[PDB]
Tab-separated table of C-alpha atoms and ligand atoms in Angstrom:
chain	number	residue	atom	x	y	z
J	3	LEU	CA	3.787	5.890	18.771
J	4	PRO	CA	7.350	4.053	17.616
J	5	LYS	CA	9.339	5.521	14.681
J	6	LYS	CA	9.625	4.522	11.063
J	7	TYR	CA	12.849	2.359	10.637
J	8	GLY	CA	14.891	0.127	7.706
J	9	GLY	CA	13.512	-3.354	8.812
E	4	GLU	CA	-11.369	-27.848	11.661
E	5	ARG	CA	-11.447	-25.521	9.493
E	6	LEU	CA	-13.211	-22.738	7.504
E	7	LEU	CA	-11.830	-23.898	4.210
E	8	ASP	CA	-13.168	-26.913	2.695
E	9	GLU	CA	-9.689	-26.656	0.659
E	10	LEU	CA	-6.794	-24.789	0.895
E	11	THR	CA	-6.844	-23.689	-2.675
E	12	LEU	CA	-8.529	-20.119	-4.749
E	13	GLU	CA	-11.775	-23.041	-5.050
E	14	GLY	CA	-11.188	-23.425	-1.436
E	15	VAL	CA	-11.003	-19.377	-0.690
E	16	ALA	CA	-13.799	-18.455	-3.090
E	17	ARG	CA	-16.287	-21.370	-1.508
E	18	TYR	CA	-15.167	-19.735	1.493
E	19	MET	CA	-16.220	-16.060	-0.017
E	20	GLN	CA	-19.551	-17.025	-1.111
E	21	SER	CA	-20.594	-18.017	2.102
E	22	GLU	CA	-22.474	-17.088	5.147
E	23	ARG	CA	-19.846	-17.185	7.206
E	24	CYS	CA	-17.161	-14.596	5.349
E	25	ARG	CA	-18.618	-11.191	5.506
E	26	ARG	CA	-15.167	-8.548	7.071
E	27	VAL	CA	-11.769	-9.238	4.145
E	28	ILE	CA	-9.263	-7.747	5.166
E	29	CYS	CA	-6.605	-6.309	2.443
E	30	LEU	CA	-2.866	-5.994	3.458
E	31	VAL	CA	-1.335	-4.567	-0.478
E	32	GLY	CA	2.197	-4.182	-0.935
E	33	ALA	CA	4.748	-3.196	-4.424
E	34	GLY	CA	3.034	-5.914	-6.055
E	35	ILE	CA	-0.021	-4.673	-7.367
E	36	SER	CA	1.541	-1.722	-8.230
E	37	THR	CA	4.146	-2.536	-10.210
E	38	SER	CA	2.043	-3.313	-13.492
E	39	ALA	CA	1.319	0.176	-13.204
E	40	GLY	CA	4.423	1.151	-13.712
E	41	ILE	CA	5.106	2.159	-9.775
E	42	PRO	CA	8.280	0.947	-9.265
E	43	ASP	CA	9.277	-0.823	-5.876
E	44	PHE	CA	10.952	2.069	-3.076
E	45	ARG	CA	11.828	-0.271	-1.263
E	46	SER	CA	13.994	-3.219	-3.586
E	47	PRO	CA	17.615	-2.708	-3.892
E	48	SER	CA	17.482	-3.447	-7.689
E	49	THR	CA	15.474	-0.055	-7.379
E	50	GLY	CA	19.080	1.770	-6.819
E	51	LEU	CA	17.271	4.499	-4.836
E	52	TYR	CA	20.195	5.155	-2.698
E	53	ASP	CA	22.174	4.854	-6.067
E	54	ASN	CA	23.637	8.216	-8.725
E	55	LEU	CA	22.583	9.869	-4.741
E	56	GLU	CA	26.642	11.068	-5.189
E	57	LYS	CA	26.136	15.361	-6.233
E	58	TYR	CA	23.643	15.583	-3.098
E	59	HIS	CA	26.729	14.808	-0.829
E	60	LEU	CA	24.601	13.308	1.941
E	61	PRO	CA	26.176	11.970	4.998
E	62	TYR	CA	24.987	8.334	4.586
E	63	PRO	CA	22.805	6.988	1.845
E	64	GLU	CA	19.671	7.169	3.580
E	65	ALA	CA	19.722	10.073	4.710
E	66	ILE	CA	17.598	11.756	1.842
E	67	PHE	CA	14.592	9.721	3.284
E	68	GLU	CA	15.615	10.642	6.725
E	69	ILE	CA	13.268	13.403	8.488
E	70	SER	CA	15.551	15.796	9.863
E	71	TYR	CA	18.240	15.837	6.876
E	72	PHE	CA	14.878	16.573	5.011
E	73	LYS	CA	13.617	19.294	7.115
E	74	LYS	CA	17.730	21.138	6.455
E	75	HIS	CA	18.181	20.297	2.750
E	76	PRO	CA	14.907	18.842	1.624
E	77	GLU	CA	16.097	19.214	-2.023
E	78	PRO	CA	17.493	15.939	-2.605
E	79	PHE	CA	14.571	14.424	-2.313
E	80	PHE	CA	12.567	16.462	-4.835
E	81	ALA	CA	15.272	16.287	-7.165
E	82	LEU	CA	14.872	13.023	-6.937
E	83	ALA	CA	11.056	13.162	-6.353
E	84	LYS	CA	11.662	14.624	-9.945
E	85	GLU	CA	12.675	11.583	-11.874
E	86	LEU	CA	10.554	8.724	-10.192
E	87	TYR	CA	7.056	10.908	-10.309
E	88	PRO	CA	4.952	8.374	-12.801
E	89	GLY	CA	3.352	9.705	-16.435
E	90	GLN	CA	0.177	8.523	-15.970
E	91	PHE	CA	-1.610	7.100	-12.276
E	92	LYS	CA	-3.708	4.167	-14.189
E	93	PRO	CA	-4.830	1.921	-10.580
E	94	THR	CA	-4.473	-1.616	-11.909
E	95	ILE	CA	-7.169	-4.853	-12.190
E	96	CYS	CA	-6.198	-5.018	-8.529
E	97	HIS	CA	-6.665	-1.641	-7.210
E	98	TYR	CA	-10.085	-2.514	-8.625
E	99	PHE	CA	-11.136	-5.963	-7.536
E	100	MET	CA	-10.752	-3.984	-4.305
E	101	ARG	CA	-12.961	-1.246	-5.783
E	102	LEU	CA	-15.382	-4.628	-5.972
E	103	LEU	CA	-14.725	-5.455	-2.545
E	104	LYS	CA	-16.425	-2.080	-1.284
E	105	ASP	CA	-19.405	-2.439	-3.753
E	106	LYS	CA	-19.916	-5.563	-1.951
E	107	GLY	CA	-20.316	-4.789	1.337
E	108	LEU	CA	-17.162	-7.165	1.430
E	109	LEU	CA	-14.251	-4.693	2.378
E	110	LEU	CA	-13.893	-3.637	6.309
E	111	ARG	CA	-9.819	-1.864	5.451
E	112	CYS	CA	-7.367	-1.662	3.065
E	113	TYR	CA	-3.673	-1.696	4.618
E	114	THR	CA	-1.664	-0.599	2.592
E	115	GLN	CA	2.642	0.213	2.121
E	116	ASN	CA	1.847	2.070	-0.917
E	117	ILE	CA	2.279	5.512	-1.480
E	118	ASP	CA	1.227	6.251	-4.621
E	119	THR	CA	-2.707	7.410	-4.410
E	120	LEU	CA	-3.465	4.263	-6.988
E	121	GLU	CA	-5.973	3.094	-3.452
E	122	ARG	CA	-7.792	6.068	-3.906
E	123	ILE	CA	-7.644	6.940	-7.121
E	124	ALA	CA	-9.844	3.300	-7.393
E	125	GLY	CA	-12.344	4.422	-5.763
E	126	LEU	CA	-10.735	3.740	-2.301
E	127	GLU	CA	-12.483	6.560	0.607
E	128	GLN	CA	-10.500	7.395	3.204
E	129	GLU	CA	-12.407	5.104	5.887
E	130	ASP	CA	-11.675	2.390	3.784
E	131	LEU	CA	-7.695	3.153	4.165
E	132	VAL	CA	-4.973	2.541	5.998
E	133	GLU	CA	-2.202	4.221	4.463
E	134	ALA	CA	0.868	2.447	6.858
E	135	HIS	CA	3.665	4.515	5.599
E	136	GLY	CA	1.790	7.870	4.291
E	137	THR	CA	0.260	8.967	0.979
E	138	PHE	CA	1.623	11.301	-1.190
E	139	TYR	CA	-2.300	12.842	-1.783
E	140	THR	CA	-1.695	14.852	0.500
E	141	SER	CA	1.482	18.002	2.074
E	142	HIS	CA	1.321	19.662	4.657
E	143	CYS	CA	3.426	22.909	5.991
E	144	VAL	CA	5.763	21.261	8.454
E	145	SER	CA	5.502	24.432	10.937
E	146	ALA	CA	3.496	22.582	14.026
E	147	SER	CA	1.385	25.443	14.447
E	148	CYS	CA	0.416	26.183	11.519
E	149	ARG	CA	-0.019	22.536	8.975
E	150	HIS	CA	-0.954	23.362	5.649
E	151	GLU	CA	-2.475	20.983	3.837
E	152	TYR	CA	-1.776	20.954	0.413
E	153	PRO	CA	-3.005	18.739	-2.773
E	154	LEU	CA	-0.831	16.351	-4.917
E	155	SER	CA	-1.974	19.385	-7.713
E	156	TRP	CA	0.144	21.715	-5.945
E	157	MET	CA	2.468	19.573	-4.921
E	158	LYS	CA	3.253	18.011	-8.273
E	159	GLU	CA	3.716	21.924	-10.289
E	160	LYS	CA	6.663	22.533	-7.386
E	161	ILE	CA	8.241	19.242	-7.769
E	162	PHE	CA	8.267	19.995	-11.753
E	163	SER	CA	9.572	22.703	-11.634
E	164	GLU	CA	12.235	22.682	-9.833
E	165	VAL	CA	10.965	25.270	-7.275
E	166	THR	CA	11.716	24.206	-3.474
E	167	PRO	CA	8.309	24.053	-2.138
E	168	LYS	CA	6.655	26.614	0.802
E	169	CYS	CA	4.213	27.218	2.376
E	170	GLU	CA	1.493	30.242	1.798
E	171	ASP	CA	0.909	31.846	4.866
E	172	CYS	CA	4.382	31.527	6.509
E	173	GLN	CA	6.730	30.143	4.085
E	174	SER	CA	7.566	26.722	6.294
E	175	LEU	CA	8.672	23.637	3.985
E	176	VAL	CA	5.893	21.515	2.722
E	177	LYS	CA	6.913	18.206	3.139
E	178	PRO	CA	4.365	15.477	1.224
E	179	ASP	CA	2.727	13.114	3.178
E	180	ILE	CA	5.047	10.476	3.174
E	181	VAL	CA	6.010	9.127	6.901
E	182	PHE	CA	10.292	9.719	6.232
E	183	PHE	CA	12.093	7.800	7.943
E	184	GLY	CA	12.433	9.293	11.896
E	185	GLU	CA	9.256	10.104	11.840
E	186	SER	CA	6.257	8.569	14.250
E	187	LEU	CA	3.682	5.671	11.937
E	188	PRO	CA	0.292	7.203	11.736
E	189	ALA	CA	-1.198	6.753	14.789
E	190	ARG	CA	-4.645	5.699	12.073
E	191	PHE	CA	-2.403	2.397	12.062
E	192	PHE	CA	-2.323	0.415	14.822
E	193	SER	CA	-5.973	2.465	16.376
E	194	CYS	CA	-7.682	0.578	12.996
E	195	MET	CA	-5.454	-2.288	13.577
E	196	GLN	CA	-6.551	-3.111	16.937
E	197	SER	CA	-10.350	-2.604	16.313
E	198	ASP	CA	-10.383	-4.145	13.255
E	199	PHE	CA	-8.241	-7.125	13.198
E	200	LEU	CA	-11.264	-8.550	15.742
E	201	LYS	CA	-13.482	-8.357	12.620
E	202	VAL	CA	-11.757	-9.599	10.151
E	203	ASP	CA	-13.683	-13.017	8.201
E	204	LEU	CA	-10.608	-12.937	5.290
E	205	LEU	CA	-7.196	-12.079	5.202
E	206	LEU	CA	-6.260	-10.464	1.279
E	207	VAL	CA	-2.684	-10.547	1.084
E	208	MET	CA	-2.223	-9.385	-1.899
E	209	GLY	CA	2.037	-7.681	-3.499
E	210	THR	CA	3.827	-7.994	-0.489
E	211	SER	CA	6.393	-9.266	0.809
E	212	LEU	CA	5.851	-9.244	4.272
E	213	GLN	CA	9.775	-8.121	5.033
E	214	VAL	CA	8.992	-4.379	6.693
E	215	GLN	CA	8.114	-4.798	10.595
E	216	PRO	CA	5.751	-3.558	11.352
E	217	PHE	CA	3.196	-3.831	8.691
E	218	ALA	CA	4.404	-7.530	8.444
E	219	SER	CA	3.049	-8.698	11.565
E	220	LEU	CA	-0.206	-7.835	10.462
E	221	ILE	CA	-0.684	-11.268	9.721
E	222	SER	CA	-0.295	-12.395	13.164
E	223	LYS	CA	-3.239	-10.344	14.723
E	224	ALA	CA	-6.073	-12.523	12.733
E	225	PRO	CA	-8.236	-14.137	14.732
E	226	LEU	CA	-6.442	-18.833	14.808
E	227	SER	CA	-9.712	-19.261	12.170
E	228	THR	CA	-9.982	-16.975	9.810
E	229	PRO	CA	-8.912	-17.883	6.632
E	230	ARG	CA	-5.193	-15.872	5.037
E	231	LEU	CA	-5.121	-16.216	0.683
E	232	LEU	CA	-1.824	-14.839	-0.405
E	233	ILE	CA	-1.310	-12.879	-3.810
E	234	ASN	CA	1.925	-13.131	-4.974
E	235	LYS	CA	4.518	-13.245	-6.976
E	236	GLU	CA	6.632	-15.432	-4.430
E	237	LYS	CA	5.709	-17.160	-1.621
E	238	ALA	CA	5.827	-15.745	1.799
E	239	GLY	CA	4.814	-14.518	5.584
E	240	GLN	CA	6.277	-18.150	6.324
E	241	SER	CA	8.482	-18.109	9.744
E	242	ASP	CA	12.276	-18.105	9.826
E	243	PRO	CA	14.081	-21.636	10.332
E	244	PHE	CA	16.756	-19.109	11.079
E	245	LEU	CA	15.180	-17.889	14.191
E	254	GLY	CA	3.897	-17.224	10.067
E	255	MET	CA	2.560	-18.514	7.080
E	256	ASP	CA	2.067	-22.325	6.630
E	257	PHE	CA	0.955	-23.217	3.432
E	258	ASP	CA	2.190	-26.610	2.721
E	259	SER	CA	2.751	-28.424	6.018
E	260	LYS	CA	0.480	-30.821	7.354
E	261	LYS	CA	-0.618	-29.090	10.125
E	262	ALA	CA	-2.015	-26.473	7.413
E	263	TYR	CA	-5.333	-25.774	7.895
E	264	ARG	CA	-5.895	-22.008	6.126
E	265	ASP	CA	-3.010	-20.205	4.769
E	266	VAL	CA	-2.907	-20.033	0.626
E	267	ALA	CA	-0.434	-19.511	-1.629
E	268	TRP	CA	-1.698	-17.844	-4.902
E	269	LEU	CA	1.902	-17.203	-7.108
E	270	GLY	CA	1.484	-15.298	-10.046
E	271	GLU	CA	0.996	-11.573	-11.271
E	272	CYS	CA	-1.284	-10.268	-8.336
E	273	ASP	CA	-3.217	-8.831	-11.344
E	274	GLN	CA	-4.003	-12.313	-13.053
E	275	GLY	CA	-5.047	-13.616	-9.096
E	276	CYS	CA	-7.705	-11.493	-8.387
E	277	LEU	CA	-8.947	-11.718	-11.643
E	278	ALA	CA	-8.570	-15.735	-11.196
E	279	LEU	CA	-10.138	-14.949	-7.886
E	280	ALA	CA	-13.340	-12.067	-8.724
E	281	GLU	CA	-13.480	-15.142	-12.519
E	282	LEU	CA	-14.786	-17.938	-9.882
E	283	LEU	CA	-16.971	-15.259	-7.207
E	284	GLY	CA	-18.760	-14.459	-10.882
E	285	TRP	CA	-17.621	-10.787	-11.010
E	286	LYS	CA	-15.312	-10.821	-13.861
E	287	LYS	CA	-17.126	-9.192	-15.620
E	288	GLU	CA	-18.247	-6.476	-13.230
E	289	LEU	CA	-14.534	-6.044	-13.403
E	290	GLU	CA	-13.586	-5.730	-16.883
E	291	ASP	CA	-16.599	-3.672	-17.300
E	292	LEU	CA	-14.660	-1.208	-14.500
E	293	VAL	CA	-11.736	-1.436	-15.050
E	294	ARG	CA	-11.624	-0.910	-18.671
E	295	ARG	CA	-14.360	2.204	-17.840
E	296	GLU	CA	-12.015	3.280	-15.849
E	297	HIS	CA	-9.132	3.173	-17.528
E	298	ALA	CA	-11.209	4.996	-20.588
E	299	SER	CA	-11.541	8.096	-18.621
E	300	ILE	CA	-8.244	8.120	-16.847
E	301	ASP	CA	-6.293	8.238	-20.221
E	302	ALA	CA	-9.576	10.777	-21.758
E	303	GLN	CA	-7.816	13.804	-19.122
N	401	WH8	C1	3.898	8.210	-6.386
N	401	WH8	C2	3.368	9.293	-6.236
N	401	WH8	C3	4.426	9.895	-6.714
N	401	WH8	C4	6.226	10.141	-6.019
N	401	WH8	C5	7.493	10.790	-5.837
N	401	WH8	C6	8.085	10.073	-6.469
N	401	WH8	C7	9.056	9.088	-5.696
N	401	WH8	C8	9.726	9.743	-4.088
N	401	WH8	C9	10.574	9.161	-3.908
N	401	WH8	C10	9.745	8.445	-2.760
N	401	WH8	C11	10.927	6.918	-1.742
N	401	WH8	C12	10.907	6.117	-0.783
N	401	WH8	S1	8.925	6.185	-0.101
N	401	WH8	C13	10.059	5.944	1.479
N	401	WH8	C14	10.629	7.043	2.401
N	401	WH8	C15	8.632	5.800	2.802
N	401	WH8	C16	7.294	5.191	1.671
N	401	WH8	C17	8.550	4.191	3.475
N	401	WH8	O1	9.490	3.829	3.142
N	402	ZN	ZN1	2.998	26.545	6.341
């Protein structure tokens, strides 16, 4: 799964 | 050539009471909880990254990064005590979504918020996609244990300034919010793949649609599906430097109601004939919470 980032 | 007879709140209300509008998805952000006293945690004006000096972080964002938290959790939990709400009273907007649920209209609420107010207002786990997790539950971080703890347990640890540790294995216990560097919830992608095949109306409330992947949800609706934005500011339009179309001659399905989210939800409920039901629900639930 994609990781959480600022944008 | 369009499902809305006009691009107004009145057009949306007439559509909602037509045979075609069966399944509503709500997309909600910080704007639906500010009137409950919950600040926007992704707003620089909240000042989360200020006053971090005593923690000697390698970079300000480390206080919300998972790898840093797991080795140095004390800064996060000190900040959590500072920001912990004094009351959890959901807003008119939250109870409007409960009315949608009661009337068989709510397919799903996708929320960016971590404050649990959707659940307090009566939305159930099945109704919710908490895109950034929630404080509602916490878990031991050890992969072989994963003991679950309720918010009452976590609140007590935060307020006593005791770093929360698992009673089974003494590992750190973390609120179920998605820290930076953690995987986004599998449920977000699973539900998105199913729900947007089925949606008749998108209600986009209290989000500026600036954080991905949440903001991309508006592009997952079928081309015909009306999209109502209830928000203090217009949002979701394409960036001219690099979407919602409210105002062009080609606009056909997107409506912006600009104002406080509670007032927009009240206006929509009033058009639907639900104002007394919503007032009665809110006043009863607020009285119940005040009496705790
Ligand atoms: C309202 C429930 C209890 C709250 C306790 C205090 C908040 C603690 C600080 C959290 C602010 C950043 S969250 C962010 C990293 C997540 C949601 C992503 O994006
Ligand atoms: Zn454990």
